[PDB]
């Protein structure tokens, strides 16, 4: 470690810990920046050499974390929990968690190489027939094609290409990750991830939330299944079975927005998928980012700074060079550089993703002046919710009208059902997926799911919660969890489940602050400077305060609550139930064993 980066001496008292935390702050922004910068150089340009460099930067990060970590223990281990300064307690608490810096050097290098190799496999995997990439090629197929065989070829090709080679590395990664966090006091890595919510009843509270939401999902599923049956017929859709996992618009069946045209209740009303209009009007990536920004400035939140526009990667590079397309928002920890990296496509769902990513940036802009240890969401779910809350307003027919994307205006029960149905495809359909992913990963980290059951347990959960089935036979050579970005990239998932509930709590509160008095699902907070001030208070808090209290100050309650989401969707929840009953649907999938046949001429 460079001499300037090494910790000095501090008295072993709270006065010393404050000086310690200040000295750490100085050196940590330098260390984080080199690490983030090397990650950027790799992710926007995947080469052997960029991986080498990133690995070197990560090693320097661990060295730093180890030295400042061990000094924090040496001086403050028996006393930091009794410090008067709550923010100081949180800073020291972070610094003394070593994670992968607990590993000896050889295992640190193994760990860093595993992350790099798993990232590369995911972001460079192709399906060959001339080879299709995930983004845009396979994404477009899953979203747009209605050919059973084509969908299958993309689904199977991607799962095989990405999943199969990851499996040996994932096993090695799990074991090392566990070894690292065990020396911080956690039974397994999952326990450390869950600790961020600082709630002893976290798993039970999530389970209770899901119990309230499940009927909504069952009704949506049944209704969509029926529409798929009308299209694909009895051979490929079982009206009492799970839906084939490739037919729902998305590689992971996680959001069903893309099959809206097949399920829309009242096709005579305004077309709520404005993708056609965006293309017709010639929208590109930077228009999408600028329109998102202006929503934020309408609230008197910050614009994107010059460094964002100069640094960001907003389209897939046309020089064909390899990049991580999966959209992400970057804090370089120097209070100046902030960037999005997205292979943006001109679609309505991408417009929402742009808002999602810009929500991350806006958090980073608002808390940049906190101590480095506190530059995070009040919990991870908060960071995930910010952009989605604004996108709830943007998606409204009224708002789309204001920005030139929906010329016809209507306010009637049919138009409302269409809107709420479309939103259900994006929000309700995701809930079981958002919930299951980390149930899977928590079982893997705990050892309940050994390598010998990775795919068996994955599909158990996928069927259990989403009521989908794989459209070709799978076995334990397959590693279908690995074909989802967050697994090889070691990004936790439960945050997205929390976010999908929390965003409706946020929406409700911001709408009330805006002075809006209509139905929750027609609220648009655009240009509410009062809504803006209430959201800014959250963003400025970082992780300086318990999330329960930040939530209470914002929405008036100190807990996750499904009631705002239920209220938002209530009209369509009622309508879907009525439709399914009148069609005599079976809710659920009692033929749990059923899988579709292969197409006759597949794949030739
Ligand atoms: C779309 O239309 C709905 C429904 O409008 C209501 O019923 C229709 C059939 C018509 O007869 C309308 O005249 C009637 O308002 C609109 O929702 C309604 O909006 C108003 C707010 O502008 C609500 O009234 C307010 O209620 C609060 C109490 O909560 C009072 O403090 C206010 O004094 C005020 O009267 C009304 O409750 C609300 N009701 C429904 C049916 O949910 C909606 O605003 C409109 N949307 C758009 C985008 O134009
Ligand atoms: C992608 O990363 C590679 C490193 O793997 C970059 O290669 C360097 O490129 C500059 C300019 O072409 C040369 O002067 C260096 O000698 C290269 N290094 C090596 C080791 O080959 C490459 O430039 C990057 N591409 C982009 C557009 O950023
Ligand atoms: C597109 C988005 N990408 C992520 C990347 C997170 C990340 C974290 C660390 C390193 C690299 C990436 C995010 O911005 O949270 C994402 O994966 N998801 C999720 C997903 O697509 O699975 C669902 C969430 C709502 C809309 C977009 C969100
Ligand atoms: C796992 O599956 C591998 C390949 O897929 C198989 O081939 C297709 C045509 C179907 O038969 C499908 O049901 C199969 O999964 C096999 O190569 C492999 O040997 C299978 N078994 C093991 C132990 O890996
Ligand atoms: Ca779409
Ligand atoms: Cl999380
Ligand atoms: Mg989509
Ligand atoms: Zn996010």
UniProtKB/Swiss-Prot annotation:
Residues that, per the record, bind Zn(2+) 1: 356, 360, 384
All copies of domain Peptidase M2, residue ranges: 11-590
Residue pairs linked by disulfide bridges in the UniProt entry: 128-131, 325-343, 511-523
Family stated for the protein in its record: Belongs to the peptidase M2 family.
Other remarks on this protein: Inhibitors of ACE are commonly used to treat hypertension and some types of renal and cardiac dysfunction.
Disease with which this protein is associated in UniProt: Ischemic stroke: A stroke is an acute neurologic event leading to death of neural tissue of the brain and resulting in loss of motor, sensory and/or cognitive function. Ischemic strokes, resulting from vascular occlusion, is considered to be a highly complex disease consisting of a group of heterogeneous disorders with multiple genetic and environmental risk factors.
The protein's name: Angiotensin-converting enzyme
UniProt organism field: Homo sapiens (Human)
Gene: ACE
Full protein stretch here: 30 to 638 of 1306
